[PDB]
């Protein structure tokens, strides 16, 4: 049985997501334009990423119990989560027809060769596409989508966390909501091992994040916020 507090936590996260993700993609007009030379797509995706960092921050703030953390713990959690939660969010625009991210128009349909033109090797792109395909194949309810983003953000084992017990306590509450959700609301055969498969997607994102942490004249073409978050 899903408790009242649990459905409230879902209701919150759905709304929080609605406010931080605009599926019209109308703000994309404001970015430096996409040019399709080396790194011709870098400015445009760096802006997208920057804009997306902001949205993730808006979303995080609405996670129940996140405001109860110190501003330091909030800051480190978002520093580490940003890129993961972006790859997550992006599943919404991602389509398996093309294996591309389709954001309403040709100019904003981003394929492997676009990501490449932002200066990225197949070493990152490939784990990244396998991830989007795997996640799409899960076929999450929008409820499970937002819980997974929340859970991803509020992880006690991220570098720089002071009060892990509190981070952990906030997270536990979300996972329990998700686990109880799946039982009560996800029917079979989709429900099969869907929690352990989701937690796996969380491990694939940590890797992607760490591989990205490894991968000056390019640092200029990024944004202030992006440089602040990725160092």
């Amino acid at each position: 049985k899903l408790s009242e507090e649990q459905q409230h936590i879902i209701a919150i996260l759905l709304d929080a997501h609605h406010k931080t993700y605009d599926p019209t993609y109308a703000d994309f007009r404001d970015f430096r334009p996409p040019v399709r030379s080396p790194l011709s797509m870098l400015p445009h995706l760096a802006d997208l990423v920057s804009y997306s960092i902001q949205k993730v921050i808006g979303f995080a703030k609405m996670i129940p119990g996140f405001r109860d953390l110190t501003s330091d713990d909030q800051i480190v959690l978002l520093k580490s989560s940003a890129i993961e939660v972006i790859m997550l969010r992006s599943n919404q625009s991602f389509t398996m027809d093309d294996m591309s991210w389709d954001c309403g128009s040709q100019d904003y349909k981003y394929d492997v060769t676009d990501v490449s033109k932002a200066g990225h090797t197949l070493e990152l792109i490939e784990p990244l596409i396998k991830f989007q395909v795997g996640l799409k194949k899960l076929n999450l309810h929008e409820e499970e989508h937002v819980l997974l983003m929340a859970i991803c953000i509020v992880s006690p084992d991220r570098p720089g966390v002071q009060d892990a017990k509190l981070v952990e306590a906030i997270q536990d509450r979300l996972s329990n909501t998700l686990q109880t959700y799946i039982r009560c609301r996800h029917p079979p055969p989709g429900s099969h091992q869907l929690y352990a498969k989701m937690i796996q997607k969380l491990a694939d994102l940590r890797s992607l994040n760490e591989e990205h942490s490894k991968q000056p004249e390019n640092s200029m073409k990024l944004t202030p916020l992006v440089l602040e978050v990725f160092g």
Partner: peptide, 10 residues
């Protein structure tokens, strides 16, 4: 170290 991050939070 993180003024823009802390601004978007507060």
């Amino acid at each position: 170290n993180h003024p823009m991050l802390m601004n978007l939070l507060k």
